Amino acid sequence: SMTRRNIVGCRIQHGWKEGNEPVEQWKGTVLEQVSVKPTLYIIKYDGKDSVYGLELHRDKRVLALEILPERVPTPRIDSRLADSLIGKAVEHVFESEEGTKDEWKGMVLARAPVMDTWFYITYEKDPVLYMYTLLDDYKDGDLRIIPDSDSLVGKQVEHAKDDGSKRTGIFIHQVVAKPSVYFIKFDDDIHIYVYGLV
């Protein structure tokens, strides 16, 4: 039979219809096909720095999915300087009114697949997976490295909610630099949760 191109590593476009809200147009890059759940894909969408998980060929909210006739950009960064951030605890500084501090404590986890100049990062105030070109903020002083403060992948898990109901989730990735940290995808949420952070 004819073999179609793998959607991983491509630029994609699709409409998004969530219930009765107006239809939106989403554009992004497919970073990974989850080995332990091949229907699930990991995507970085333009303008959204929280990474998403979607069963792109099954989910009824995804409309007219297509591969764009574009190449995924391939910029370069200094390899040694990028690896110096991996596994480190950081303070990420954000713009705010003068005489007011807006900083978030977090941890740099890995260089992302496909978009290797972007980095996976998690925070204490928001435990979902984020992605950003952190070396831009590190060189400008807006990211500070702070002193020093066998895998569940594939295993299913259940969560007992406040109301009378349960939800299933699956461990999808083990962070190589910090093997006690994992990524979980629950079937009722598009965000990727970060588990095992202190």
Side-chain angles (χ1 to χ4, degrees), residues 1-100 102-104 106-147 150-154 156-164 166-198:
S1 66
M2 197 189 83
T3 69
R4 295 169 289 174
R5 285 161 77 207
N6 191 1
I7 203 172
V8 170
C10 300
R11 290 282 297 160
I12 60 160
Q13 185 172 287
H14 70 83
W16 178 259
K17 187 84 174 69
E18 177 69 270
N20 59 75
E21 283 266 78
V23 70
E24 304 185 338
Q25 285 296 320
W26 288 13
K27 286 172 81 181
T29 301
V30 185
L31 314 175
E32 188 163 316
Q33 175 165 27
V34 177
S35 178
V36 304
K37 190 179 176 88
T39 54
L40 174 70
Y41 297 98
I42 307 309
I43 315 100
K44 169 62 169 84
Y45 288 103
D46 304 346
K48 296 167 229 255
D49 293 320
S50 55
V51 177
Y52 296 154
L54 288 173
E55 289 182 300
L56 291 164
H57 306 300
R58 289 170 61 83
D59 201 310
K60 74 213 178 193
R61 294 165 288 175
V62 174
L63 312 176
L65 174 68
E66 60 182 321
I67 287 161
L68 291 162
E70 301 198 298
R71 220 193 83 259
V72 164
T74 65
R76 303 183 292 101
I77 61 178
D78 181 80
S79 299
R80 193 206 128 280
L81 186 66
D83 296 350
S84 74
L85 296 190
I86 306 288
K88 302 295 208 299
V90 289
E91 283 174 355
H92 207 163
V93 181
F94 296 95
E95 193 194 337
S96 66
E97 285 158 300
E98 189 143 48
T100 299
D102 194 349
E103 307 183 358
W104 274 27
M107 192 184 273
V108 182
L109 308 161
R111 289 180 75 168
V114 177
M115 294 171 66
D116 70 296
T117 67
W118 294 62
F119 290 84
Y120 285 159
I121 173 158
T122 192
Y123 302 94
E124 288 175 17
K125 288 171 161 169
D126 194 347
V128 301
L129 181 51
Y130 280 86
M131 195 162 145
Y132 196 65
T133 54
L134 291 175
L135 285 184
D136 301 344
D137 296 343
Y138 177 60
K139 131 267 211 215
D140 291 340
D142 293 347
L143 187 82
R144 316 199 199 87
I145 296 156
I146 54 161
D150 51 4
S151 181
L152 302 172
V153 172
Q156 276 244 4
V157 72
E158 221 181 68
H159 173 234
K161 296 186 277 181
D162 297 9
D163 73 271
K166 308 294 197 278
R167 66 169 184 175
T168 75
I170 187 161
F171 290 85
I172 66 177
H173 180 84
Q174 171 173 248
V175 179
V176 173
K178 279 275 191 296
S180 55
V181 180
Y182 294 91
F183 299 172
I184 310 163
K185 172 65 171 70
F186 277 87
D187 9 70
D188 74 336
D189 198 343
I190 69 171
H191 298 93
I192 311 307
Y193 298 174
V194 183
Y195 174 86
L197 214 219
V198 177

